[PDB]
Amino acid sequence: SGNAKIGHPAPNFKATAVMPDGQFKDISLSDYKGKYVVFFFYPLDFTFVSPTEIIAFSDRAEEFKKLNCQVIGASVDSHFSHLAWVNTPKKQGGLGPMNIPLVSDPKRTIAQDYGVLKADEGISFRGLFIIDDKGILRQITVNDLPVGRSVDETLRLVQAFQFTDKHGEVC
Amino acid sequence: GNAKIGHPAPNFKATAVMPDGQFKDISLSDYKGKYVVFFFYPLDFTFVSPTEIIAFSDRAEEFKKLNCQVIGASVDSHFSHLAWVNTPKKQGGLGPMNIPLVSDPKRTIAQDYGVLKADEGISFRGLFIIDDKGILRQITVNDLPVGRSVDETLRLVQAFQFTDKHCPA
Numbered sequence: 003s004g005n006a007k008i009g010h011p012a013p014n015f016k017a018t019a020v021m022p023d024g025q026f027k028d029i030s031l032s033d034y035k036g037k038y039v040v041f042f043f044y045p046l047d048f049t050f051v052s053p054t055e056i057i058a059f060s061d062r063a064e065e066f067k068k069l070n071c072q073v074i075g076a077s078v079d080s081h082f083s084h085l086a087w088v089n090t091p092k093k094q095g096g097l098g099p100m101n102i103p104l105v106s107d108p109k110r111t112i113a114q115d116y117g118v119l120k121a122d123e124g125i126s127f128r129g130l131f132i133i134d135d136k137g138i139l140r141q142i143t144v145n146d147l148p149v150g151r152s153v154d155e156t157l158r159l160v161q162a163f164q165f166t167d168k169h170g171e172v173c
Numbered sequence: 174g175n176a177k178i179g180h181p182a183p184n185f186k187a188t189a190v191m192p193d194g195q196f197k198d199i200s201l202s203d204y205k206g207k208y209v210v211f212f213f214y215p216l217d218f219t220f221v222s223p224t225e226i227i228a229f230s231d232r233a234e235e236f237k238k239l240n241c242q243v244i245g246a247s248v249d250s251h252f253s254h255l256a257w258v259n260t261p262k263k264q265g266g267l268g269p270m271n272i273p274l275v276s277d278p279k280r281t282i283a284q285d286y287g288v289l290k291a292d293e294g295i296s297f298r299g300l301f302i303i304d305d306k307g308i309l310r311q312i313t314v315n316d317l318p319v320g321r322s323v324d325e326t327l328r329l330v331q332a333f334q335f336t337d338k339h340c341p342a
């Protein structure tokens with residue numbers, strides 16, 4: 003199930019995020035019209051594989067910015083939980099300061115809209131979605147919980163979609 | 174469709190063109206006990222798909238080392254698949270294959286895996302990693318213009334196998 007379909011508008015959302023400046027902020031996917039978006043879910047805060055993924059995307063956010071691409075992470079934890087994790091230094095097992103926003107999905111409706119809810123557990127799988135600058139979903143990636151994602155592979159995909167966007171442009 | 178992470182991957186029985194060039198009816202369940210990479214491509218005689226098919230075929234031994242069977246699939250007929258296999262690579266053909274290519278002419282396999290492009294009766298570039306028990310572990314779906322990476326697929330297969338395992342010495 004879910005409503006994430008290739009070639010269709012990616013499901014919009016409006017949710018509280020912890021922004022890179024460390025403050026909250028209600029943001030919507032539609033805020034990022036005109037930019038590509040990498041939108042990725044992770045199961046929950048304060049775990050072992052997820053911080054390595056989050057820090058990798060945050061550390062390399064400049065490479066996405068050079069592609070006019072916004073990276074957004076998300077999980078079902080509360081926005082206070084996200085902020086606590088950001089405020090915990092990397093040296094102590096936290097995220098430390100972030101270059102990307104982290105969305106809170108406490109009612110699980112965004113995870114359900116993207117088809118990545120592990121219903122038996124109330125957490126999301128490791129879903130990653132590439133959305134173009136028109137808001138159209140271009141790529142779906144979902145990993146079972148034990149195996150993380152690759153920033154290199156994500157950049158390869160974003161670059162490839164932008165390259166092919168140039169043949170016979172819809173106008 | 175019915176492809177859900179953590180659930181049995183949808184079975185199928187379909188005619189494939191096999192590496193030896195002959196047609197055989199195969200099923201996903203034929204490969205229980207091994208990991209499976211099952212990937213869809215839109216149509217034969219296209220220009221992005223042959224790069225992927227040839228790469229998976231060329232590197233099939235790297236999947237064999239991981240006890241992993243690679244299977245490709247498209248809605249085109251198995252006769253079309255073999256015609257492309259038999260076309261010289263010099264003329265844009267696939268050349269001899271190390272992997273089977275499944276034919277999905279009824280579109281039911283693509284629908285079961287949730288990768289049918291409904292307005293155009295062909296599959297998106299869906300790729301599915303299925304473990305040795307038949308459970309779906311990974312979903313990858315690309316829009317038509319953008320191909321997949323064998324390196325990334327190998328990384329994922331190996332990582333699922335490692336985490337499946339973890340002597341307490």
Ligand SMILES: *C1=C2C(=CC(=O)C(O)=C2C)[C@]2(C)CC[C@@]3(C)[C@@H]4C[C@](C)(NC(=O)N[C@@H](CC)C(=O)O)CC[C@]4(C)CC[C@]3(C)C2=C1
Nearest residue numbers: 009011035036134135136137138167168169170171172173
């Ligand atoms: C190409 C197309 C457009 C829509 C469409 O359906 C189609 O098939 C093609 C090939 C758009 C996206 C529509 C908006 C355009 C034309 C935009 C707008 C404007 C004001 N021109 C028009 O709206 N033309 C309409 C109405 C007179 C028409 O009937 O042709 C100025 C041109 C401009 C800015 C640029 C192109 C496009 C974005 C466009 C192109």
